[PDB]
Amino acid sequence: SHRKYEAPRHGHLGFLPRKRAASIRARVKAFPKDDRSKPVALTSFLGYKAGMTTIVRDLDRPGSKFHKREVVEAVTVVDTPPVVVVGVVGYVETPRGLRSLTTVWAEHLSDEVKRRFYKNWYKSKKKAFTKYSAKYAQDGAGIERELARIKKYASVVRVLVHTQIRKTPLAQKKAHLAEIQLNGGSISEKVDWAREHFEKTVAVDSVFEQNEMIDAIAVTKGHGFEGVTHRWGTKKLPRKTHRGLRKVACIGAWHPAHVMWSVARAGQRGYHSRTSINHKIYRVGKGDDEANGATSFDRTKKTITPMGGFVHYGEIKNDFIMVKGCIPGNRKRIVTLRKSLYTNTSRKALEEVSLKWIDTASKFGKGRFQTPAEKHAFMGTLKKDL
Amino acid sequence: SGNGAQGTKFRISLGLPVGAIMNCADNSGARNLYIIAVKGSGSRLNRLPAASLGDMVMATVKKGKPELRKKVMPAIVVRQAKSWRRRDGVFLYFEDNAGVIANPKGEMKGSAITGPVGKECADLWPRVASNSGVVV
Amino acid sequence: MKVEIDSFSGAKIYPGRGTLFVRGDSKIFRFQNSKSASLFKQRKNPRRIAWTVLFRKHHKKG
Amino acid sequence: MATRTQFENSNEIGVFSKLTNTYCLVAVGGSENFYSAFEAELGDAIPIVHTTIAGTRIIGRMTAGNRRGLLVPTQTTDQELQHLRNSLPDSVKIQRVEERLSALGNVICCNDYVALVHPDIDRETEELISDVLGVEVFRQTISGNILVGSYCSLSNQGGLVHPQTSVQDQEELSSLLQVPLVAGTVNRGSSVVGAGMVVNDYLAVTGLDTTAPELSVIESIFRL
RNA sequence: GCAGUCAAGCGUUCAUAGCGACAUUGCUUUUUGAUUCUUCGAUGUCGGCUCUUCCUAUCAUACCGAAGCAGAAUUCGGUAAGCGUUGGAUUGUUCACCCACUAAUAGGGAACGUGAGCUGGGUUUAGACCGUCGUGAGACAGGUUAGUUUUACCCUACUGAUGAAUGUUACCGCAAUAGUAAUUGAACUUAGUACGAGAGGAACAGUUCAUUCGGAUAAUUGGUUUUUGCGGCUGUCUGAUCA
């Protein structure tokens, strides 16, 4: 028998299987395509998601209905500590894909990547990299041997970085190590760049910029085990149904005498690796930059932190990317921001924008005020000090 | 939305499905309308075609002059009372629902329109805008 | 960019904050949040709601 | 020359445009064939200003005024008002108008001499209208229609009115307005004639559905 | 039910743009028959709701060929199911015909899919009514009403979740394999141009939005509320208060 009314499926068979991610750090599966002409730089960046806020900007889209007119839209603020390099690693192209042939670590690693290797830091003898730090006693014949082998071989060059988790209002103290590919020409130049930038700050005023489309890779918010209505979208059954009205009703035909892989079942919803492309950056704000939240129309001295801090996160005194729209991943997750794979000639990209108003009212209620000086103006003096 | 309308309207919220009786807000003689489908609407299994502000609906008349009764006629929604989002920031909603009878090109069968008219309707339908009173 | 004043309490309304209401006589009302709106749809008199502005402006509060 | 013009499919020029003696206000969302009929015969006579009013494109029915004034409603923003202040010359008088009864273009059907408005507008706004425009404001409805802006196009030479109108009210408005009136239609007999075309002393742009017997009566009564 | 081959004639003329008589070769198993090999120490027996997958004899979409294709609309066909195929009234419906939108309202299979998934309107136990037939008990190829639908805690399949061992342990990765996803319309423009005697009247590229789907989020908006968080109110009980 045919379906008697034919409908679009529930859910998407390409985001299968829906098991949980490896860890909270989402692997970047692929990096932008390399051309050996650009100056040497990074491809991705690691940060932490601080929440959302509201942006009033002048839409400038010729031929639209709101041309040169104010709109409001949502942005996510993703926090940015200056990410610091602690090593490089080169891969040789083999007939079974790229294979890491050697890796080189820096000289004096910070205690955060020394905290990353230990499940039990407090018991430990804290002996991370001791017999590797002893390899700098001579002029460095082993280490320069390793770098000459990376120069001779290894068509691609990736760099082990980590975030500086202590500069964050988090409470974790452990840094997430990662790899980042490079875009410059002539891999000797890449690895000399890496050897120069061992243990050096790399801030986002060099990797990203204003108005540019970036992809964002993170792990989904976790909602645990889940039933098949809210997971897949399947119709609830009527009121009258014995044995469960929030289900898939029919599992399948008689023959195939097995349950198909494409029917909707109950399982894990959330905590998957997701990737969302073409997100526009509206601000690249800086930590030493006082008054992040002023604008050329606004001009009042305030940060992008809401009154009373971001909910569940803290207060941004750090750099930040401020990116249009939503983003996969909730607050306090390691979010990886990546340069675009293709050049985006679409006129939704390449729209050079500047903001007009950043919302910094309290996200913890219905925020009636943006700055506390404004509240002391409006609400007036109280039963406190005077 | 649909053929014969002038301009493109950004998506505003659908709060009037098949069967909604709206307080007909012109002097044409109809006292109320009754949505029977929406021009330009799409198809999904067990989904009612819903109307919104400014959209053209086929509708009938359940009251009024008995010349106007018992016949399917085009109509145009001018108030919604389900809150839709303008791009400039606001979510906004009228006191009630409303509608005016039209021809398939957009002319008012009546002459005058009473009360408010939402501007996302008046910009899409020109003939309504001229007979309109309060815009927004 | 305009800072709209409220219709019920008297607070200030940032862009994208609260609803807009058009009563059928086309007198448009703006509401700060869900609170002052849902009080206004009870037809409360804002001159006798003790935390609003037209209350405090009338009894000379500060 | 009653030039026939589409606004991209439609033939009511009075919706998307406001034609006066010193200024011409037009919508922004149009092609060159909508503006060639204006810019060929006008050329270097009056400034044509591309703008919007109150977040719409119906600025012919939103604002209403004469050679001396341009009255703007509530929802017109700061940037639109500043661009119209810098674009239009200093002879016109622009004023924000507070009324919740209609839009201003549907209410006011006026010229340089005599205004006819909606009968339900109050006294404080009427004093503002007669102050800014400098026009003795009168209060009348044509053929029962309370919107005189939709069924009456007015100029200093003459005027086109609602097609189903008795001769007695035509003679009363000919004694009041001191102009001769002839009841006619526009755009293959469309009854909405207050928006079907614009007119001033030099130009009267009509719609493409206007045939020759309607156009001859229009160019006879407005005396181009 | 579908498709050929031949081809008398229609089609202004002209067998084959499209059709096609008289004949004739087949395919299919979504009909119904014929048989009765399996099941009567019992595979739960109509319809709908739900949900996945598959075929193609394609309705729409993509790209093209032919015309009695000027344009527009159509008609015949080729690769192709990749993706989509509806909301309603009456009826238990399958089918059905209607209203209305739509780009389109294609056809089917999977134990005439799917009852330890549902509902139980129909059929088909026992009650009862009417008509007809019967001498009667009762029969109905007919109408109407009222009528209980049980179990998963096994193996497997599927979806999710851990896991001993290849020196231990941790971090950073590669990729075999397996899945995949986007879809479609409207308006403006080209443009009352091309094409046309006129009536009528497009397309290619561009711009702005939208339909169905999919994944995410929660600033704002709405919903939920045991923050029983704050305020109010009834009845009673703490002697009244306060709580």
From Swiss-Prot, chain A:
Pros-methylhistidine modified-residue sites: 242
Modification after translation (UniProt): Methylation at His-242 by HPM1 is required for proper 60S subunit assembly and promotes translational elongation fidelity.
GO molecular function: RNA binding; structural constituent of ribosome
Cross-link Glycyl lysine isopeptide (Lys-Gly) (interchain with G-Cter in ubiquitin): residue positions: 38, 135
Superkingdom of source: Eukaryota
Cellular compartment(s): Cytoplasm
SUPFAM superfamilies per UniProt: Translation proteins
Disruption phenotype: A mutant confers resistance to trichodermin, a trichotecene toxin produced by plant-pathogenic fungi.
Keywords, sorted A to Z: Cytoplasm, Isopeptide bond, Methylation, Phosphoprotein, Ribonucleoprotein, Ribosomal protein, Ubl conjugation
GO BP annotations, alphabetical order: cytoplasmic translation; maintenance of translational fidelity; ribosomal large subunit assembly; rRNA processing; translation; translational elongation
Residues annotated with Phosphothreonine modification: 102
PROSITE patterns: RIBOSOMAL_L3
A GO cellular-component term linked to this record: cytosol
Residue numbers bearing the Phosphoserine modification: 23, 155, 296
Record PANTHER family: 60S RIBOSOMAL PROTEIN L3-RELATED, LARGE RIBOSOMAL SUBUNIT PROTEIN UL3
Function (record text): Component of the ribosome, a large ribonucleoprotein complex responsible for the synthesis of proteins in the cell. The small ribosomal subunit (SSU) binds messenger RNAs (mRNAs) and translates the encoded message by selecting cognate aminoacyl-transfer RNA (tRNA) molecules. The large subunit (LSU) contains the ribosomal catalytic site termed the peptidyl transferase center (PTC), which catalyzes the formation of peptide bonds, thereby polymerizing the amino acids delivered by tRNAs into a polypeptide chain.
Family membership noted in the UniProt record: Belongs to the universal ribosomal protein uL3 family.
From Swiss-Prot, chain B:
Entry-linked Gene3D superfamilies: Ribosomal protein L14
BP GO terms, sorted: cytoplasmic translation
Signal peptide span: none
Subcellular location: Cytoplasm
Gene Ontology cellular-component annotations: cytosol; cytosolic large ribosomal subunit
Pfam families from the UniProt entry: Ribosomal_L14
PTMs per UniProt: Methylated by RKM1 at 2 different sites, but it is unclear which are the 2 methylated residues among Lys-39, Lys-105 and/or Lys-109.
Residues recorded with modification N6,N6-dimethyllysine: 105, 109
GO molecular function, one term: structural constituent of ribosome
Record keywords, A-Z: Acetylation, Cytoplasm, Methylation, Ribonucleoprotein, Ribosomal protein
Sites bearing N-acetylserine, chain numbering: 1
Complex and partners: Component of the large ribosomal subunit (LSU). Mature yeast ribosomes consist of a small (40S) and a large (60S) subunit. The 40S small subunit contains 1 molecule of ribosomal RNA (18S rRNA) and 33 different proteins (encoded by 57 genes). The large 60S subunit contains 3 rRNA molecules (25S, 5.8S and 5S rRNA) and 46 different proteins (encoded by 81 genes).
Family label: Belongs to the universal ribosomal protein uL14 family.
Further details from the record: There are 2 genes for uL14 in yeast.
PANTHER family listed in its UniProt record: 50S/60S RIBOSOMAL PROTEIN L14/L23 (PTHR11761), LARGE RIBOSOMAL SUBUNIT PROTEIN UL14 (PTHR11761:SF8)
Protein name: Large ribosomal subunit protein uL14A
Species this chain originates from: Saccharomyces cerevisiae (strain ATCC 204508 / S288c)
Swiss-Prot record, chain C:
Subcellular location: Cytoplasm
Disulfide bridge partners, by residue number: none
UniProt superkingdom: Eukaryota
Residues that bear Phosphoserine: 7
Subunit structure: Component of the large ribosomal subunit (LSU). Mature yeast ribosomes consist of a small (40S) and a large (60S) subunit. The 40S small subunit contains 1 molecule of ribosomal RNA (18S rRNA) and 33 different proteins (encoded by 57 genes). The large 60S subunit contains 3 rRNA molecules (25S, 5.8S and 5S rRNA) and 46 different proteins (encoded by 81 genes).
Note: Present with 247000 molecules/cell in log phase SD medium.
Function: Component of the ribosome, a large ribonucleoprotein complex responsible for the synthesis of proteins in the cell. The small ribosomal subunit (SSU) binds messenger RNAs (mRNAs) and translates the encoded message by selecting cognate aminoacyl-transfer RNA (tRNA) molecules. The large subunit (LSU) contains the ribosomal catalytic site termed the peptidyl transferase center (PTC), which catalyzes the formation of peptide bonds, thereby polymerizing the amino acids delivered by tRNAs into a polypeptide chain.
Family membership: Belongs to the eukaryotic ribosomal protein eL24 family.
Protein name, per record: Large ribosomal subunit protein eL24A
Source organism of the structure: Saccharomyces cerevisiae (strain ATCC 204508 / S288c)
Chain's gene name: RPL24A
Residues included from the entire protein: 1 to 62 of 155
Curated annotation (Swiss-Prot), chain D:
InterPro entries tied to this protein: eIF6 (IPR002769)
Keyword field contains DNA repair: no
Keywords for this protein: Cytoplasm, Initiation factor, Nucleus, Phosphoprotein, Protein biosynthesis, Ribosome biogenesis
The organism's place on the tree of life at top rank: Eukaryota
Residues making up the signal peptide according to the UniProt record: none
SUPFAM superfamilies: Pentein
Modification after translation, per record: Phosphorylation at Ser-174 and Ser-175 promotes nuclear export.
GO BP: any one term: ribosomal large subunit biogenesis
Phosphoprotein as UniProt keyword: yes
CDD domains given in the database record: IF6
One MF annotation (Gene Ontology) recorded for this entry: translation initiation factor activity
Family classification: Belongs to the eIF-6 family.
NCBIfam families hit by this protein: eIF-6 (TIGR00323)
More details: Present with 18600 molecules/cell in log phase SD medium.
Assembly behavior: Monomer. Associates with the 60S ribosomal subunit.
HAMAP family according to UniProt: eIF_6 (MF_00032)
Protein name: Eukaryotic translation initiation factor 6
Recorded name of the encoding gene: TIF6
